[PDB]
Write a protein that binds this ligand. Structure first.
Ligand SMILES: Nc1ncnc2c1ncn2[C@@H]1O[C@H](COP(=O)(O)OP(=O)(O)OP(=O)(O)O)[C@@H](O)[C@H]1O
Ligand SMILES: Nc1ncnc2c1ncn2[C@@H]1O[C@H](COP(=O)(O)OP(=O)(O)O)[C@@H](O)[C@H]1O
Ligand SMILES: Nc1ncnc2c1ncn2[C@@H]1O[C@H](COP(=O)(O)OP(=O)(O)O)[C@@H](O)[C@H]1O
Ligand SMILES: Nc1ncnc2c1ncn2[C@@H]1O[C@H](COP(=O)(O)OP(=O)(O)O)[C@@H](O)[C@H]1O
Ligand SMILES: [Mg+2]
Ligand SMILES: [Mg+2]
Lengths: 193, 80, 1622
């Protein structure tokens, strides 16, 4: 049960979902909990005096904001999500996120296209570290761009290759992938010539 | 005070570095037709205005640091 | 004698006038013809006033007065009847037409039947006797109508649940408010009233077409008159339900457009694949079909031709039929250009421009395809384009057309859009289309982001219109919460409409996260809708919205627009951003936009013009001076291009008319060739950009016009007809008019510029410094347009920052989800409804006030081309063409680029309003308007002649005013503040002469006497009006300079400044010293609060205030705290008996509510024919509102104080608005007086220049050492009369007191501690303290007098000290001062360090020994433990001193304590002990976690009731921890200063309190019956029975914060720094 924090009705859903899950053993995820620091202090107190089911899990997604109460940070286990340290780490994360069955489809050339996708994505984010030189500003090149890129490759590969096992590299719609990526997927965030 | 003396030296030293005079460009019937004069007149006008403000602000600061004038709300913010 | 005939005519009309009655479904006879009834009443009322103007009015006055009462009653009765009748009509159709409401809502269905039966009863009575006077003579008819209106509102407000259900039946009702939805449902039978509501539910349907039965819907119509005829007419008889046949109309609208599109496609296939096209055949096809169909068919024909050509070239080596496609487009475009060159009907012209825009895009695309050597139809350089495929073989007409772009396929929604302004398909537009369509295919939203004016909002609509979608634009703000936005989604999902949410980052971040759930849930429904496995035969796709299952249409889409570069905007959560596809649109292709727009408008040199006009806008942005009100973006370029087409059309019409009236020779080709297109564009540029330019930039732009457009000049038209109207209006309004270089020519030019901007823009901004003539410009223009065009002009002036944003736009109740209208919303909705003919008038809504992004960004969609006011409840209000939105502002330093771009700008400068014209206005008013309401006017005319030589260019006043701006004033000096001060004083001089003439009926003032008095008075007035807000030195400076320039005789004193002289009515100078005598105060009135020792400064300020106060002119007293501002005003108010003063203590948290609470107590709201008037309850009394801390109220981040704007509105406009009913309230008999410290003081802010223009300021500085000696030497001389032996010590004692006060004031300042303020208030307390001790003493040796003097000084100057070093200074300096002024006295006897005084060991206040005091306190503490509090206390010397200080204040009237020290030091315990010793009852509030402001008010009411009605002495002990909100301190501040809270007792609480006050006054033996004396006795009781003890910790920043949050804590409370234990 996933709930987005921020509304009065959302707190009611969060309290109800937690109460149900600690007895049934379900998983509850509360997102952007950094927007309600006051309610976070109440929630940590509720969690401490509680004996939930063995399979119960509560995941709290939030930004790294100083407003998050310290007691909640001490009560929970902290996992930091940030850009991977390097190109190799970036490419390993991409290949882990994309399911194997998606990459290993009928066209044998799909695997190579996904690799160029991972390499292009990895190079792009690693350039973001060098803010003035790699790019001109902190563009939000993220997982959404990679997922949209993967969908675009899948759509146009299946369009050109009608279920065939092998497609010659000349027939791959390179122009479609390049143009949609430079204008819509990654170029949409770009506002500099 | 320690900071009161420290700010006095900085304000007086700063007044030495910044120049004191900057004359506005003169409008002429044929000067207006020159785009270069059209751009440059804005440059000096902005420069002369801003020069007058900063120097006056520092002047007031040295006056406060010597106790000659009382601190105001703007002067408190500027000194802070 | 013609007056009698007019009365007879009016009598005959009303004796013959009858209410026009028409039957209503055989139920009653409803009143018809309201407009004639209201117009006749208005015409007769205006006539009734005219007869009064004539002197013959007296002979028929009583009969005329009796008449105006009757017409006012007629107007009052029928101003409600029209509302009642209309409300009953649609309420009747709901409780009768529908059957489910009787079971659902039975209770108020019977309630409606009861009130209805009353309504038919009343209607039949009106029927029996249709005479208007007979209807008016029905007993209680006015009360009956109001009761009907009140009841109908309750039933109407109780139909919300029914309305929500009806919206589910017809989904488009979700975009209609509750007010209009009830009208639609009730008026289902009579469709004629439904025509004004179709625009809110459809994109392009403004009205429907019916047969002459009004039973069959034959089609639909647009706002431009374009009609679509249904192939299958919808009959309302077969489907009587409103929601049933509306669905059929919507369904038929889509089908008939699809079938017409199929016919048009077949027709347009002939024009395609054709080498030559006949213009007549093409034009006939264009006129046959609708605007959106001709563009769509041309899109289809071109797409198939390219697809056909690319299939032919698929072999690679084949020929290139792509050239045939290009030539056909070029041939068609040539016919299109030729058609535009010749005159065309407006509807056909717009169709041609849309077709031109499309084919220019097609030509560019086809040229690109040829240049790219494209030979395959599957190439992405063709698939990336948007292609249109038609399949006539498809059975479903709604599926015959498919729109494809890349891999995204869309079906045309076939929603009728009317005639929408097409966009030029720029490469940025294509990139937007590609990205947004990719998002649509991914079932994701779109986020075009970038700076303002880049085409983001139009791009979303343009793409939606291209797909035939209903795009709804929402201007979002912080009020768009989870529930409001979720309900908007429900309407969009069920309808299948596009929702474009602009400024979507203006939502709160918590709200932004919350709506992500709904957007994600909606997209999952859309994603599962696109899967081929789903079949429409199964259950329709539904999603979870607002805990309801809501059907989702596949045509639904969500688009958000933001400017992420605006500081202070919310950051979207990442889980929300991943739900959208973002695209940066930062640099629109303006050159291509300009070229295509000019090409479609009929310019032969469009390419040359575009290459000249786009760089020119860039040149103006970088070469003109940088001003915050300058905008040279695409929106400004869009306006000039549109106006260029309008000007060219107007010029072409002009040339044709000249040819027609000069011979007969008209040729379109000749006119088009010999037409100065350069001058047309230049005229359009100047008409839009000149008014905003500053004086220095006007030559700059006209120079730039010479390089870019050499040889063409701008000759503005001479609006002779309007100028004559302006001259007449200005003459009647006492305003100076000039032509060109004459005095006032610049102002007249600004007015003409304002008139031109009104015609181009519906949004305007008058920008300029305070007193630049902005308001006078639009007032004169509004009247002149009324007298010229004959259209009545109505102006609604709103101060947006004088009220809250909730009160300005409206509030959505979080619980019941009910919408209440705001101020702007109510005015706009009333105009739109036009119940009283508001659409036939020129309605101007002026936003006179400060502009900041929080409130004005809500008007973005209003000031765009959308012209919609979007509210969070899903309601959208369209701006009528007769409404203008104006902003009268003094600066735009806080406005953003979005607001500035959307509005036309006229820049006003102080130069526009020349000082000469202000002098002329003052003199013209003086010679015309009598001051009584004329002998006074005659005096005014002779006086105006005398001041004429001085009110001239570079005259005495002008020269003085110029010299005054070079001096230093306690407040910012503005021209109109000084002159308004001068004019009011000159009015007093005329009133003074009248008084002399009245006092001397035999000998009135002579001309020579008047001349001398006016001349001397004028110099006297100039000094005080121009230097009253300055210190003594600059008052001397101004007097010296005036002596240098003036020819008026002046006092010949060698060194005494002129400011020390007054002007006697004798016309001779007389020193002010003659009015200040050395008075001797009585012994019992020594240093009393109401006793003022006259001085030079006192008499000068008193006579000054009397001059200003009398004229009822608001004024501000400025000076250091304790200088004597409050003392002077009360002393000056004594000469004003009819004036009653109410004291208000402003704080940092003060809002206009405190002003409103005072009004609800001392005044009453009276409804009058003119309107609601707020006047004091006391009759013949002027209420003086005295505000003590006017510059204390908090400034927001945009430099505005809400209460100051409220007061500025109340003075400049004479009233305010009631948020309860958005009703204008006019003040009467209510004046305002302000007091403040200099703005440079901490916590004080500079007052707005617009406010300061109406309030003169006089600086009251501290009295000098010579003045202090006189003020307090007198008090000492009287005080020391009790003991004759000490009388010889009166002089040295004052000298010691004066000296020590000066050293203490110089040694301790606010720089060290925030509370280190020393004023003559301490010196007054010094004399009171010595006098109080000396009263009982029969005799005292000089040594005892010094001991008392030393003791009081230690209590006044040492108790507040923080550091021991300061206290040691006080102790030693006191030793030195006393020995300096009292030599040869016993030093040890009179100055033993334990200086302790008490009245505990005896009856009198005499010095007490430390050990005897300790023993007595020990004995009392023993009783204290066994009776009240058993907490043992260790007694040390500091405790003994503290309990004596606390005992001192508890024995004083209105005595309050501020104990500052570390927690646990004994402050609370000691205060309870002394309070028990003095018999005071200890009251403490019990704060818990649920303690709120309402609990504090009830707790306060308990203390006030006990200490005010029961005569009970109570020590109210309050700690800083007890304060849970700023509301606590606001009431505490008022209670500490005045002794009463204005809004504490209201309703039944006030009624009970007056009963207790009557009982309490009866107990005391006083006979008070009326409420106002009961409250005054109650206030006097609390001031003498309540002792508030505030305890706080010695925080550094907390003390400074409290000095502004609660100013009374440092002025009315004695501060005692206990600190920590030493
Ligand atoms: N053309 C004119 N001739 C003579 N007197 C004028 C003229 N225009 C304005 N005035 C007078 O001068 C003063 C200017 O006030 P006005 O309200 O026009 O200024 P403003 O620029 O709108 O001020 P603010 O920004 O303070 O609202 C008023 O007293 C007005 O009566
Ligand atoms: N491609 C275009 N063709 C014609 N006009 C355009 C184009 N793009 C923008 N405009 C004009 O620019 C003006 C401002 O655009 P707007 O929708 O306000 O952009 P934003 O969403 O950035 O505020 C609109 O009136 C629109 O007519
Ligand atoms: N001419 C005077 N005669 C008598 N008292 C004076 C005179 N001038 C000043 N004072 C004293 O100065 C004090 C002014 O206090 P207040 O009226 O509250 O000033 P403000 O309103 O500026 O704070 C009074 O207590 C008054 O006794
Ligand atoms: N002079 C004193 N002798 C002994 N105890 C004291 C004395 N003053 C304060 N206390 C202690 O302080 C407690 C009461 O708190 P209080 O002093 O009233 O707080 P505050 O000083 O913050 O008002 C009592 O329990 C008492 O023991
Ligand atoms: Mg927009
Ligand atoms: Mg004004």
């Amino acid at each position: 049960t996933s709930i987005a924090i921020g509304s009065a009705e959302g707190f009611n859903q969060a309290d109800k979902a937690i109460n149900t899950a600690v007895k049934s053993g379900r998983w509850v995820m509360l997102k952007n909990v950094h927007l309600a620091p006051g309610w976070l202090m109440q929630l940590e107190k509720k969690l401490h005096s509680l004996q939930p089911h063995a399979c119960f899990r509560l995941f709290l997604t939030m930004e790294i904001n100083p407003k998050v109460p310290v007691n909640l940070l001490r009560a929970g286990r902290i996992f930091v999500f940030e850009p991977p340290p390097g190109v190799k780490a970036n490419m390993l994360r991409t290949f882990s996120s994309i399911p194997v069955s998606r990459i290993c489809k009928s066209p044998n050339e799909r695997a190579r296209l996904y690799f160029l996708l991972a390499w292009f994505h990895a190079i792009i984010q690693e350039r973001l570290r060098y803010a003035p030189l790699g790019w001109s500003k902190k563009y939000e090149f993220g997982e959404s761009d990679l997922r949209s890129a993967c969908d675009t490759v899948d759509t146009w590969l299946d369009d050109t290759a009608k279920g065939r096992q092998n497609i010659s590299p000349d027939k791959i719609p390179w122009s479609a992938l390049k143009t949609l990526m430079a204008q819509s997927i990654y170029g949409g965030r770009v506002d500099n010539e | 005070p320690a900071w009161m003396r420290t700010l006095h030296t900085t304000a007086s030293n700063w007044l030495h570095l910044i120049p004191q005079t900057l004359s506005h460009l003169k409008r002429t019937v044929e000067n207006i037709k020159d785009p270069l004069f059209r751009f440059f007149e804005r440059e000096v006008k902005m420069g002369a205005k801003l020069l007058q403000d900063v120097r006056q602000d520092l002047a007031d600061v040295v006056q406060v640091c010597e106790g000659k004038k009382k601190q105001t709300n703007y002067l408190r913010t500027l000194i802070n | 004698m013609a007056l009698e005939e007019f009365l007879k005519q009016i009598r005959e009309v009303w004796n013959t006038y009858e209410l026009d009655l028409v039957n209503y479904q055989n139920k009653c006879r409803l009143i018809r013809g309201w407009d004639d009834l209201f117009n006749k009443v208005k015409e007769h009322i205006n006539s009734v006033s005219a007869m009064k103007l004539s002197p013959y009015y007296k002979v028929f006055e009583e009969d005329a007065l009796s008449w105006e009462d009757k017409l006012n009653r007629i107007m009052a009765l029928f101003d409600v009847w029209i509302d009642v009748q209309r409300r009953w009509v649609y309420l009747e159709g709901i409780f009768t037409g529908s059957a489910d409401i009787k079971h659902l809502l039975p209770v108020e269905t019977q309630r409606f039947q009861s009130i209805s039966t009353e309504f038919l009863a009343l209607m039949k009575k009106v029927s029996k006797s249709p005479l208007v006077m007979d209807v008016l003579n029905i007993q209680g008819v006015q009360r009956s109508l109001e009761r009907l209106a009140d009841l109908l509102g309750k039933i109407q407000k109780a139909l919300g649940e029914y309305l929500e259900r009806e919206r589910s039946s017809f989904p488009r009702f979700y975009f209609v408010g509750d007010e209009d939805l009830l009208e639609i449902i009730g008026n289902s039978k009579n469709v004629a009233k439904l025509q004004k509501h179709f625009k809110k539910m459809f994109a392009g349907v403004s009205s429907i077409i019916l047969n002459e039965d009004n039973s069959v819907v034959l089609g639909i119509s647009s706002r431009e008159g374009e009609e679509v005829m249904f192939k299958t007419p919808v009959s309302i008889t077969e489907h009587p339900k409103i929601n049933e046949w509306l669905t059929l109309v919507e369904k038929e609208m889509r089908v008939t457009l699809a079938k017409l599109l199929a016919e048009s496609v077949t027709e347009v296939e002939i024009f395609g694949k054709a080498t030559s096209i006949d213009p007549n055949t093409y034009i006939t096809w264009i006129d046959k079909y609708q605007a959106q169909l001709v563009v769509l068919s041309a899109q289809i024909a071109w797409s198939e031709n390219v697809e056909t050509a690319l299939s032919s070239m698929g072999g690679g080596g084949d020929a290139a039929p792509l050239h045939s496609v290009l030539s056909n487009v070029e041939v068609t475009l040539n016919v299109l250009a030729d058609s535009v060159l010749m005159e065309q009907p407006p509807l056909r012209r717009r169709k041609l421009e849309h077709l031109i825009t499309e084919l220019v895009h097609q030509r560019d695309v086809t040229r690109s395809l040829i240049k790219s050597k494209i030979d395959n139809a599957k190439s992405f350089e063709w698939l990336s384009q948007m292609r249109f495929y038609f399949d006539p073989k498809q059975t479903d007409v709604l599926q015959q057309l498919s729109i494809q772009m890349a891999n995204a396929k869309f079906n045309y929604g076939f929603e009728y859009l009317g005639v929408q302004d097409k966009l030029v398909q720029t490469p940025l537009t294509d990139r937007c289309y590609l990205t947004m369509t990719q998002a649509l295919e991914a079932r994701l939203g779109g986020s075009p982001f970038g700076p303002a004016g880049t085409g983001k909002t139009e791009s979303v609509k343009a793409l939606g219109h291209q797909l035939g979608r209903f795009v709804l634009v929402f201007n979002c703000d912080e009020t768009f919460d989870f529930q409001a936005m979720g309900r908007i989604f429900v309407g969009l999902c069920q309808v299948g409409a596009w929702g474009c949410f602009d400024e979507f980052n203006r939502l709160e971040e918590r709200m932004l996260s919350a709506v992500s759930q709904q957007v994600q849930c909606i997209q999952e429904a859309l994603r599962e809708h696109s899967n081929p496995n789903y079949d429409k035969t199964s259950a329709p796709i539904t999603c979870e919205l607002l805990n309801k299952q809501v059907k989702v249409s596949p045509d639904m889409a969500i688009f958000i627009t933001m400017n992420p570069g605006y500081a202070g905007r919310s950051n979207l959560p990442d889980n929300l951003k991943k739900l959208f596809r973002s695209l940066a649109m930062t640099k629109p292709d303006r050159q291509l936009i300009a070229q295509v727009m000019l090409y479609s408008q009929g310019f032969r040199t469009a390419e040359v013009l575009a290459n000249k006009i786009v760089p020119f806008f860039k040149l103006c942005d970088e070469q003109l001076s940088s001003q915050s009100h300058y905008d040279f973006g695409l929106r400004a370029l869009k306006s000039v291009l549109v106006s260029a087409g309008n000007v060219k059309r107007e010029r072409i019409q002009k040339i044709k008319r000249e040819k027609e009236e000069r011979g007969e020779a008209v040729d379109e080709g000749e006119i088009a060739e010999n037409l100065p297109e350069q001058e047309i564009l230049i005229q359009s540029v100047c008409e839009t950009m000149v008014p905003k330019l500053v004086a220095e930039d006007i030559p700059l732009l006209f120079s730039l016009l010479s390089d870019v457009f050499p040889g063409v000049q701008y000759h503005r038209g001479e609006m002779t007809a309007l100028r004559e109207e302006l001259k007449k209006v200005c003459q009647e309004m006492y305003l100076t008019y000039g032509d060109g270089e004459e005095v006032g020519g610049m102002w007249v030019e600004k007015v003409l510029q304002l008139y031109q901007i009104t015609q181009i823009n519906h949004g305007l901004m008058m920008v300029g410094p305070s007193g630049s003539g902005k308001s006078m410009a639009w007032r004169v223009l509004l009247k002149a347009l009324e007298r010229l065009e004959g259209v009545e002009g109505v102006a609604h002036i709103i101060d947006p920052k004088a009220i809250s944003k909730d009160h300005l736009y409206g509030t959505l109740d979080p619980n019941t989800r009910e919408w209440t209208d705001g101020l702007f919303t109510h005015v706009l909705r009333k105009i739109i409804d036009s119940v009283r003919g508001e659409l036939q008038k020129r309605q101007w809504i002026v936003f006179d006030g400060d502009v900041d992004p929080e409130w004005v960004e809500n008007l973005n969609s209003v000031l765009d081309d959308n012209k919609l006011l979007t509210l969070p409840n899903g309601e959208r209000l369209s701006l009528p063409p007769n409404v203008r939105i104006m902003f009268e502002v003094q600066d735009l330093k806080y406005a953003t680029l979005a607001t500035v771009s959307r509005c036309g700008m006229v820049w006003f400068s102080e130069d526009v309003l020349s000082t000469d014209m202000i002098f002329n206005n003052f003199l013209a008013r003086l010679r015309s308007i009598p001051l009584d309401e004329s002998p006074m006017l005659q005096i005014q005319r002779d006086a105006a002649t005398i001041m004429q030589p001085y009110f001239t260019s570079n005259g005495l006043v002008t020269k003085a005013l110029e010299h005054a701006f070079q001096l230093e004033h306690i407040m910012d000096l503005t021209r109109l503040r000084c002159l308004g001060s001068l004019f009011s004083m000159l009015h007093q001089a005329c009133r003074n002469v009248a008084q002399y003439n009245a006092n001397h009926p035999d000998f009135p003032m002579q001309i020579e006497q008047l001349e001398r008095y006016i001349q001397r008075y004028l110099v006297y007035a100039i000094l005080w009006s121009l230097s009253g807000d300055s210190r003594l030195k600059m008052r001397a400076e101004l007097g010296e300079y005036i002596r240098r320039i003036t020819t008026v005789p002046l006092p010949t004193a060698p060194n005494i400044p002129i400011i020390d002289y007054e002007v006697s009515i004798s016309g001779e100078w007389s020193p002010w010293q003659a009015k200040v005598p050395q008075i001797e105060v009585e012994t019992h009135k020594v240093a009393a609060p109401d006793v003022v020792v006259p001085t030079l400064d006192t008499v000068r300020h008193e006579a000054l205030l009397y001059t200003w106060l009398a004229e009822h002119k608001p004024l501000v007293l400025c000076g250091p705290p304790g200088s004597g501002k409050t003392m002077t005003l009360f002393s000056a108010l004594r000469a004003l008996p009819d004036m009653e003063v109410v004291g208000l203590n402003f704080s940092s948290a003060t809002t206009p509510e405190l002003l409103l609470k005072t009004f609800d107590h001392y005044c009453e709201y009276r409804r009058t024919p003119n309107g609601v008037v707020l006047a004091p309850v006391q009759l013949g009394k002027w209420l003086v509102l005295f505000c003590d801390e006017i510059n204390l109220p908090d400034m927001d981040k945009y430099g505005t104080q809400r209460v100051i704007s409220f007061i500025r509105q109340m003075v400049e406009h004479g009233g305010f608005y009631r948020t309860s009913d958005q009703t204008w309230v006019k003040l009467e008999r209510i004046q305002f007086v302000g007091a403040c410290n200099p703005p440079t003081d901490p916590g004080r802010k500079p007052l707005s220049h617009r406010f300061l223009r109406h309030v003169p300021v006089v600086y009251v500085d501290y009295p000098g050492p010579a003045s202090l000696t006189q003020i307090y030497g007198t008090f000492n001389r009287a005080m020391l009369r009790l003991i004759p032996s000490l009388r010889t010590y009166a002089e040295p004692l004052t000298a010691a007191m004066v000296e020590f006060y000066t050293m203490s004031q110089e040694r301790f300042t606010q720089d060290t501690q925030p509370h280190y303020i020393y004023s003559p208030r301490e010196m007054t307390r010094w004399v009171r303290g010595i006098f109080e001790a000396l009263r009982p003493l029969e005799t005292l040796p000089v040594e005892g007098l010094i001991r008392i003097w030393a003791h009081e000084a230690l209590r006044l100057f040492q108790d507040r000290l923080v550091e021991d070093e300061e206290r040691r200074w006080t102790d030693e300096n006191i030793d030195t001062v006393a020995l300096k002024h009292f030599p040869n006295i016993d030093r040890e006897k009179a100055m033993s360090r334990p200086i302790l005084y008490s009245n505990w060991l005896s009856k009198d206040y005499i010095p007490v020994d430390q050990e005897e005091l300790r023993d007595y306190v020990k004995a009392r503490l023993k009783v204290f433990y066994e009776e009240e509090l058993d907490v043992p206390l260790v007694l040390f010397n500091e405790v003994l001193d503290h309990v004596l200080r606390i005992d001192r204040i508890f024995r004083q009237p209105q005595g309050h304590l501020l104990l500052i020290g570390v927690s646990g030091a004994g402050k609370t315990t000691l205060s309870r002990f002394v309070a028990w010793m003095n018999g005071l009852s200890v009251y403490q509030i019990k704060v818990h976690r649920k303690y709120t402001g309402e609990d504090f008010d009830e707790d306060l009411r308990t203390v006030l009731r006990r200490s005010g009605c029961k005569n009970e002495k109570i020590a109210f002990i309050m700690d800083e921890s007890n304060v849970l909100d700023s509301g606590f301190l606001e009431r505490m501040n008022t209670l500490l200063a005045n002794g009463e809270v204005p809004g504490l007792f209201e309703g039944d609480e006030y009624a009970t309190l007056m009963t207790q006050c009557k009982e309490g006054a009866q107990k005391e033996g006083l006979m008070l019956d009326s409420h106002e004396e009961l409250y005054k006795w109650f206030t006097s009781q609390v001031i003498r029975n309540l002792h508030v003890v505030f305890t706080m910790n010695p925080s550094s920043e907390g003390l400074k914060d409290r000095a502004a949050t609660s100013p009374a804590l440092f002025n009315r409370c004695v501060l005692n720094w206990f600190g920590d234990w030493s």
